[PDB]
């Protein structure tokens, strides 16, 4: 879904969670959180609309 | 003929000017109403250009 955090994109997060403008001027940064945020037995704490 | 030629040339210039509306020019369709009614603005911008 990081691929959807870009201008002109579509999908659940882009349409209903975080929408970037057509003429965005800036940067999008992302990195692997699997060690910190994911807990043994599944991490179900983060929600998306 | 010298009087008919000017009216014919202007009529032909207007006819070709209008016929240039029936031309794709690299767009998916000639009628801009169809691109604005069928394509998302992020791509309707490029199809209109």
UniProtKB/Swiss-Prot annotation, chain A:
Changing residue 47 to R: In strain: Delta/B.1.617.2, Epsilon/B.1.427/B.1.429, Kappa/B.1.617.1, Lambda/C.37, 19B/501Y, Omicron/BA.4, Omicron/BA.5, Omicron/BQ.1.1; Contributes to cellular immunity evasion and increases infectivity. Changing residue 47 to Q: In strain: Omicron/BA.2.12.1. The lineage of its organism: Viruses, Riboviria, Orthornavirae, Pisuviricota, Pisoniviricetes. This is Spike protein S1. Residues 43-49 are annotated as: Immunodominant HLA epitope recognized by the CD8+. Attaches the virion to the cell membrane by interacting with host receptor, initiating the infection. The major receptor is host ACE2. When S2/S2' has been cleaved, binding to the receptor triggers direct fusion at the cell membrane. When S2/S2' has not been cleaved, binding to the receptor results in internalization of the virus by endocytosis using host TFRC and GRM2 and leading to fusion of the virion membrane with the host endosomal membrane. Alternatively, may use NRP1/NRP2 and integrin as entry receptors. Binds to host ACE2. RBD also interacts with the N-linked glycan on 'Asn-90' of ACE2. Cleavage of S generates a polybasic C-terminal sequence on S1 that binds to host Neuropilin-1 (NRP1) and Neuropilin-2 (NRP2) receptors. Interacts with host integrin alpha-5/beta-1 (ITGA5:ITGB1) and with ACE2 in complex with integrin alpha-5/beta-1 (ITGA5:ITGB1). May interact via cytoplasmic c-terminus with M protein. May interact (via N-terminus) with host bilirubin and biliverdin, thereby preventing antibody binding to the SARS-CoV-2 spike NTD via an allosteric mechanism. It comes from the Viruses. Changing residue 12 to N: In strain: Beta/B.1.351, Omicron/BA.1, Omicron/BA.2, Omicron/BA.2.12.1, Omicron/BA.2.75, Omicron/BA.4, Omicron/BA.5, Omicron/BQ.1.1, Omicron/XBB.1.5, Omicron/EG.5.1; May enhance affinity to human ACE2 receptor.
């Amino acid at each position: 879904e990081v691929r959807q955090i870009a201008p002109g994109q579509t999908g659940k997060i882009a349409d209903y969670n975080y929408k970037l403008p057509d003429d965005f001027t800036g940067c999008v940064i992302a990195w692997n959180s699997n060690n910190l945020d994911s807990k043994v037995g599944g991490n179900y704490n983060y929600l998306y609309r | 003929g010298k009087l008919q030629d000017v009216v014919n040339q202007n009529a032909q210039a207007l006819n070709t000017l209008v016929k240039q509306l029936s031309s794709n020019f690299g767009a998916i369709s000639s009628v801009l109403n169809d691109i604005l009614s069928r394509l998302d603005p992020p791509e309707a911008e490029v199809q209109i250009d």
